[PDB]
Design a protein around this ligand. Structure first.
Ligand code: NAG
Ligand code: NAG
Ligand code: NAG
Ligand code: NAG
Ligand code: NAG
Ligand code: NAG
Ligand code: NAG
Ligand code: NAG
Ligand code: NAG
Lengths: 1019, 193, 48, 49, 48
């Protein structure tokens, strides 16, 4: 029957050792979970199966019924055959002509082996080799380039039947140079004597197919896992990313395009008049042979075999069929009558009465000669005297010459005075054909076709397919070859136009022959296939999106982005988690759901002309802003990378100019720019500021950001965690210059900046560091964000507790949320990937015979090897130039990020910035810099309103006819009394003359209310 | 999109970008900059404009005494904005320029397929059909070298243009944060005056 | 080799970058704010 | 196995024939040559890195 | 001669520009447009 292969049939692709790396290779492999044909030895059985590419043989048995295998083309003594057998002494591999039985086997007797019934005769024996449920045998047999490979594995397993669900890589155990084809495979079984009763065992056959497999190697080098790229879209995504585990996201893996279903050839809907020539009533005499010019016509030269009756034809150029492909400017048909025995003279190179004096073909003739007996038409009782032939002539005729003169031939020296007489002969003789002549003397009509090809259009030439509409087809319209779908068109083509061209030279439409209809050619549907996945860790469920594909080509949903299957469309909207496109994002309720994105929760503010919202309370929030400052200072050597340790390639490379100096200087420039970037961002302080040994900061705690002495690197817990979170080699021609500033030195710079901002506020950035108590510095920053300093002093304990809580939470968030340092990880990954691709391009041939320079130099002489070495040199030069350009662009992006980071350090750390959201969401209080590998993390401490209360509001207060406006803050009304408060904090105060200023009167200001302005001087 | 090219639709549609713009406009007219800072605090728009006047060093009273004049001037300027946009050609040129540059880049890239690059013909099918393998492969390689060089030049130019657009988008985001989400005291960052 | 794979990867990167640019420029509001039904803005007109 | 490869497509180890042992192949040392110079005016004495 | 032909919706050539007739025609041919906007355009190179 058929069993499930599960994950078996994987073998080591080669003797190459790999440790802890994923390797993708395309070889003959058994597909995962494929149907494998399994047979039971016992009958209540060894059929001959084909071999094809390869065979995976699985054996579940305890008494070793399966003793051997037989490979070959005919499996008999007629042809050489391969035989592997286990006779209980050793495995014997014999390539000889064996005559196997209809049921060859090894008969085991009572236990001892007694009978060997596998073969009866051994012939030629070209090759011979000898090598010395509860168990599982796995074997892979393949035959490639004359080498036969056996991969073996033993795995003890307890199972009733079928393959176990366990992954085992098959180690190659035998490799033999057999040299003979294998098209049939037969297994050998051990027959148990009772009449035979085979043991109860299961043997499984799985055919190898060309498959791409991603195999995961471990530190030992064993293949611990594998992925079949063609098994399903999730495995194809794993192969595309070169990783077994894929994170949540969209991934473009391959492209779907519809192949043409069938080919249609379209050609215009007059025939050459060959009937007028061969079936003419009268034919000319040979001396006056007739010539018919044929032109401007199409002819069916295939039927020459039946252009006339009882014909006899011979072509001296190519076959009559090939005449049908060919075209010619003119065809000539010469025709005449002669005797049967003279037809042999109508051939190139002949001499005789006819060839010499009547009709002469050239020695290089390439045409056709056709002749048929015309006795019934041209012979007459009494003699047909119409047909004549020239018997005398003073010289032979030149090819295709015609002579119709009738001058008396003067055979002697006397004149003939124009009359026949002695030695004065009329030059023509009649054949006088009579029906009773022998066939040699009967008349034959003859047609000679000559094919001229001069300098002009070939107007004489030698298919039409049914039109199909709205189907992807490969079409041929009068020599226009293309692929697409043909649909009805509304374009009014002018009568002389055959095909329509859309802008940028595209074949948009064509008028069809025999119908004159204009058909629009829409290119066959093609689009990438994207894979929606919530991540293999979360779920193996997968959705598929065909980009720009209508839902007509193989739950479904049609979107502007294309046809998406595997995800259910849901009307209600959610925040986007996976991007699809066209405003649609897609995992919920144990399934993938596709929805239109919801841009935000709807929040309408209750606007009123007299209503205000004042924050009665606030909160301190610390946010991280992570900015890359530099990339790895990579350096390539153009000479070594392109031309490896060889003088010959170096001499040719020198002919390409100063490319290697330009590329090296460009990389040197980016490396110097990286050093300058780090220096600009971090070295903004003239002096190194040191935090006081006593952390008396009025209750503020900076333990998470101040450097920790106990750690052996003067780094704070937060930056130490950042270093621990981000995770990161010697090549040929490639080096990584170390950064000018060490991580310890960069951390010391960050600590100095942090000490300076903690102790002197923003003064150290402006100039000399002036000590100021941290609560007083916080009060100045609060005054800077429009909140009176008394608010902090009245709430110093609350603010310090909030600050410490936020500082703890931010380290927790950095430690708990992945991809927080993803911006820094991305640049490291991009640099590493570019380096990896550049090294990988060394193994690309670029059209050369081999990628490795030594092989092409050793096997080819320098005069010919120079072109191959040039192909490799130009390919490597182009690759290095591309890598340098990618690095230059990436360095420009990194420099922009570093400039932003330097500006943010100058305006958010060295000072308090009033730019909104430049230093974190909310009113910016301060920032703390932290070092990170190739980056800086800014901890922005910001002030955010927490509790908001409504208040009735008046623009001005009317007192004794005068209008009073708040000097600072706004007027508020809790519902009984009016007060003056700062806008960013609810601290109501009685309306007085010291906090309000009088302007104009009450009859100009619109929307004001009456109240009493208490004058402090009055009481 | 007929020669192996594709134009992926933008993630945010025209209506959804308009909805984001409408939300920002409502936030500015209803809360001033408080919605950008955090929770939206309801503010009277004349009072919000009065504090914005206070932000540029002009006392709040001048707006209240001249509220009608300011409103008339603001409405007239907003009306003039439509006239300026609709009556000045090339006013939207800064966007049309990038759209045209992308279109020209695609047009040149697909016109480069018509190029021979020294091969006997630009069309791959005819040269493959009419040439034997050991010279057809040389011609195909020459066309592939030319086409790949054209594609790489187009990709590099697109990357440079993308960097320029990335800088422009960063400036636009900074302008949205500083001018729209708040009030900017850096002169000429959000217009003259 | 993977020359065209590099080109396709770069083009995919620029497309994602355009998406990120639009998201960064326009999605600066956590919640969609709706204008009040009545336009009582003290004489200022926002109909345009 | 007969020879080992690195993470990249480069050979890190080989199984030496004639002894059946494992030999690590390290790319033999190479590097750039830089010259520390205070300037022709200051001094002609230079150092080689 | 090089001619810039304006094919209408019907495919009929409704107008043409002789690229060598005059510098304005050279500008029209270089711009690949029948109407050139205000400005300076580089059409060809003069050499002795
Ligand atoms: C506050 C006010 O007067 N609003 C009006 C508005 O209703 C009208 O649509 C617009 C016409 O452009 O003129 C203004
Ligand atoms: C082509 O010939 C067919 C019959 O052979 C006829 O039906 C059709 O109208 C012809 N088309 C032309 C002449 O365009
Ligand atoms: C998978 O995700 C869960 C949370 O969804 C997490 O706890 C777990 O560590 C993740 N495992 C891996 C291997 O990523
Ligand atoms: C896509 O397919 C649907 C269903 O067959 C059809 O209604 C629709 O018009 C098609 N769209 C296009 C552009 O062909
Ligand atoms: C303000 O909020 C903080 C944190 O929510 C709280 O601890 C504090 O008691 C609040 N103060 C007032 C006056 O409501
Ligand atoms: C700051 O918090 C840390 C948390 O472990 C604590 O050990 C330290 O004592 C705190 N510092 C002060 C000054 O309270
Ligand atoms: C409003 O404020 C007044 C004066 O401080 C106070 O007496 C009164 O209880 C408050 N009323 C309300 C509704 O809060
Ligand atoms: C606000 O509008 C109401 C009408 O809804 C009006 O009665 C009141 O006087 C207005 N107040 C102000 C301050 O404009
Ligand atoms: C060298 O140094 C001297 C004095 O320090 C200075 O005048 C001169 O310009 C420098 N350069 C050269 C090339 O002499």
């Amino acid at each position: 029957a058929y069993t499930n292969s599960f994950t078996r049939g994987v073998y080591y692709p080669d003797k190459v050792f790999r440790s802890s790396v994923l390797h993708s290779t395309q070889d003959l492999f058994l597909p995962f979970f494929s149907n494998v044909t399994w047979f039971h030895a016992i009958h209540v059985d060894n059929p001959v199966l084909p071999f094809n590419d390869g065979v995976y043989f699985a054996s579940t048995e305890k008494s070793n019924i399966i003793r051997g295998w037989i490979f070959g083309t005919t499996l008999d003594s007629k042809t050489q055959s391969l035989l592997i057998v286990n006779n209980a002494t050793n495995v014997v591999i014999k390539v000889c002509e064996f005559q196997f039985c209809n049921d060859p086997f090894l008969g085991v007797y009572y236990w001892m082996e007694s009978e060997f019934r596998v073969y009866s005769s051994a012939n030629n024996c070209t090759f011979e080799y000898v090598s010395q449920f509860k168990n599982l045998r796995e074997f892979v047999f393949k035959n490639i380039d004359g080498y036969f490979k056996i991969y073996s594995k033993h795995t003890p397993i307890n199972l009733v039947r079928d393959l176990p669900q366990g992954f085992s890589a098959l180690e190659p155990l035998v490799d033999l140079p057999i040299g003979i084809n294998i098209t049939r495979f037969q297994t050998l079984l051990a027959l148990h004597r009772s009449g035979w009763t085979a043991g109860a065992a299961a043997y499984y056959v799985g055919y190898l197919q060309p498959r791409t497999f991603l195999l995961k190697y471990n530190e030992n080098g064993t293949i611990t896992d594998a992925v079949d790229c063609a098994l399903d879209p999730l495995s194809e995504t794993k192969c595309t990313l070169k990783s077994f585990t894929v994170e949540k996201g969209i991934y473009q893996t391959s492209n779907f395009r519809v192949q043409p279903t069938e080919s249609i050839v379209r050609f215009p809907n007059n025939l050459c008049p060959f009937d007028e020539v061969f079936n003419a009533t009268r034919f000319a005499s040979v001396y006056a042979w007739n010539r018919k010019r044929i032109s401007n016509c199409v002819a069916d030269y295939s039927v020459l075999y039946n252009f006339a009756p009882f014909s006899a034809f011979k072509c001296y150029g190519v076959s009559p069929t090939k005449l049908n492909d060919l075209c010619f400017t003119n065809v000539y048909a010469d025709s005449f009558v002669i005797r049967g025995n003279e037809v042999s003279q109508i051939a190139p190179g002949q001499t005789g009465n006819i060839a010499d004096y009547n009709y002469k073909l050239p020695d290089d003739f390439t045409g056709c000669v056709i002749a048929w007996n015309s006795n019934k038409l041209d012979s007459k009782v009494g003699g047909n005297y119409n047909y004549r032939y020239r018997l005398f002539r003073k010289s032979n005729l030149k090819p295709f010459e015609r002579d119709i003169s009738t001058e008396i031939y003067q055979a002697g020296n006397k004149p003939c005075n124009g009359v026949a007489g002695v030695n004065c002969y009329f030059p023509l003789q009649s054949y006088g054909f009579r029906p009773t002549y022998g066939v040699g003397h009967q008349p034959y009509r003859v047609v000679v076709l000559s094919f001229e090809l001069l300098h002009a259009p070939a107007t004489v030439c030698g298919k039409s397919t049914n039109l199909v509409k709205n189907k992807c087809v490969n079409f041929n319209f009068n020599g226009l070859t293309g692929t697409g779908v043909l649909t009805e068109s509304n374009k009014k083509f002018l009568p002389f136009q055959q095909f329509g061209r859309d802008i940028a030279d595209t074949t948009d439409a064509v008028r069809d022959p025999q119908t004159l209809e204009i058909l629009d050619i829409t290119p066959c549907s093609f689009g990438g296939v994207s894979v929606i996945t919530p991540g293999t860790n979360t779920s193996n469920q997968v959705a598929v999106l065909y980009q720009d594909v209508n839902c007509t080509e193989v739950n479904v949903f049609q979107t502007r982005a294309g046809c998406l299957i595997g995800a259910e469309h849901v009307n209600n909207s959610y925040e986007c988690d996976i991007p699809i496109g066209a405003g649609i994002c897609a995992v919920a309720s144990q399934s993938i759901i596709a929805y239109t994105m919801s841009l935000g929760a709807e929040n309408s503010v209750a606007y009123s002309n007299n209503s205000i919202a004042i924050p009665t309370n606030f909160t301190i929030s610390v946010t991280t802003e992570i900015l890359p400052v530099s990339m790895t200072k990579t350096s390539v050597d153009c000479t070594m990378y392109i031309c490896g340790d060889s003088t010959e390639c170096s001499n040719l490379l020198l002919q390409y100019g100063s490319f290697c100096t330009q590329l090296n200087r460009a990389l040197t420039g980016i490396a110097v720019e990286q050093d300058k970037n780090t220096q600009e961002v971090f070295a903004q302080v003239k002096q190194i500021y040191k935090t006081p040994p006593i952390k008396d900061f009025g209750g503020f705690n900076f333990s998470q950001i101040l450097p920790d002495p106990s750690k052996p690197s003067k780094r704070s817990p937060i930056e130490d965690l950042l270093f621990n979170k981000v995770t990161l080699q010697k090549f040929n021609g490639l080096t990584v210059l170390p950064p000018l500033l060490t991580d310890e030195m960069i951390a010391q710079y960050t600590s100095a900046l942090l000490a300076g901002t903690i102790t002197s506020g923003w003064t150290f950035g402006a100039g000399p560091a002036l000590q100021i108590p941290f609560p007083m510095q916080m009060a100045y920053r609060f005054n800077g964000i429009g909140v009176t300093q008394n608010v902090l002093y009245e709430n110093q304990k609350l603010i310090a507790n909030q600050f410490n809580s936020a500082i703890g939470k931010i380290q927790d968030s950095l430690s708990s949320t992945p991809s927080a340092l993803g911006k820094l990880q991305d640049v490291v990954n991009q640099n590493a990937q570019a380096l990896n691709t550049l090294v990988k391009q060394l193994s690309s041939n670029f059209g050369a015979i081999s990628s490795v320079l030594n092989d092409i130099l050793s096997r080819l002489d320098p005069p010919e090897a120079e072109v191959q070495i040039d192909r490799l040199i130009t390919g490597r030069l182009q690759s290095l130039q591309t890598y340098v350009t990618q690095q230059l662009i990436r360095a420009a992006e990194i420099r922009a990020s570093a400039n932003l980071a330097a500006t943010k350090m100058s305006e958010c750390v060295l000072g308090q910035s009033k730019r909104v959201d430049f230093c974190g969401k909310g009113y910016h209080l301060m920032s703390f810099p932290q070092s990170a590998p190739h980056g800086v993390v800014f901890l922005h401490v910001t002030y955010v309103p927490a509790q908001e209360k409504n208040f009735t509001t008046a623009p001005a207060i009317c007192h004794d006819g005068k209008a009073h406006f708040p000097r600072e803050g706004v007027f508020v009304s809790n519902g009984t009394h009016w007060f003056v408060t700062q806008r960013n904090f609810y601290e109501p105060q009685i309306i007085t003359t010291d906090n309000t200023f009088v302007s104009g009167n009450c009859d100009v200001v619109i929307g004001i209310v009456n109240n009493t302005v208490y004058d402090p001087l009055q009481p």
